[PDB]
Structure 1
Amino acid sequence: YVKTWFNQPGRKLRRRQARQTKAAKIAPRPVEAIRPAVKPPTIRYNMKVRAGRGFTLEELKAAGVSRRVASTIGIPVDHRRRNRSEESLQRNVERIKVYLAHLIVFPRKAGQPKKG
């Protein structure tokens, strides 16, 4: 079998139309969730900083965001990752704190019974 790439420009267009389709549904919030900053796990790459999967629970507790609130305002949680050093904790705590500064959370209507 020989795989051909004639749909390469048609996949590019289809993926872009999905981003536009996604943005139409969720109008003002970002098309991606904020990702942490981590360091790759080798002696070849540990100097580089890249994006992680989600923020650790210890990073969210320091930033002031609970693990149940976090998912609702676009902050992924990684229950697996941990902070073995204070630099990873502070690098990503500041990342969450900056995110909260630039964030507008629209209020939600709440059911409110008469008494009690």
Structure 2
Amino acid sequence: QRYVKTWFNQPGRKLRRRQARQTKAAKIAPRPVEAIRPAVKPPTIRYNMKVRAGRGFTLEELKAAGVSRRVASTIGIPVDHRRRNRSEESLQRNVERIKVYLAHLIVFPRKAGQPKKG
């Protein structure tokens, strides 16, 4: 029962993180605070009946959904080069996760580079 961890900074850690959320999105307004995560099945027998947020959409999920790896991280769609679709169920649950995302997305135009000649 030596050195103790005492949580008197729990209420101030609650606000420190709230202000960090406030500081972050204020820097990147139009875009959401967080990325979209996929929906994945937990890897056990106690938990395979539930759905939970994944780490990102695999290469094939984005390929069928219509975004390539390079343009999918710009618009905020994390990729997961580890995860892979072993069954058509997970493919369809996450392909139509990006479908609703790409419908609700307003990609603002950037600045182009136009050389004087061709």
Q: TM-score, normalised by structure 1?
A: 0.99
Shift of 1:28: 1.2
Alignment RMSD: 0.5
**CA–CA distance in 1 between the matches of 2:94 and 2:116?**
44
Unaligned runs of 5+ in 2: none
Residue 87 of structure 1 aligns to a residue whose secondary structure is helix
Unaligned runs of 5+ in 1: none
Shift of 1:18: 0.2
Q: How many residue pairs were aligned?
A: 116
Shift of 1:114: 1.5
Q: TM-score, normalised by structure 2?
A: 0.97
Mean CA deviation greater in 106-115 or 2-11: 106-115
**CA–CA distance in 2 between the matches of 1:107 and 1:115?**
23
Aligned position for 1:37: 39
Partner deviation per Cα, 1:88-108 (whole Å, 9 max, x = no partner): 000000000100000101000
**CA–CA distance in 2 between the matches of 1:79 and 1:101?**
24
**CA–CA distance in 2 between the matches of 1:96 and 1:74?**
11
**CA–CA distance in 2 between the matches of 1:115 and 1:84?**
51
**CA–CA distance in 1 between the matches of 2:29 and 2:44?**
40
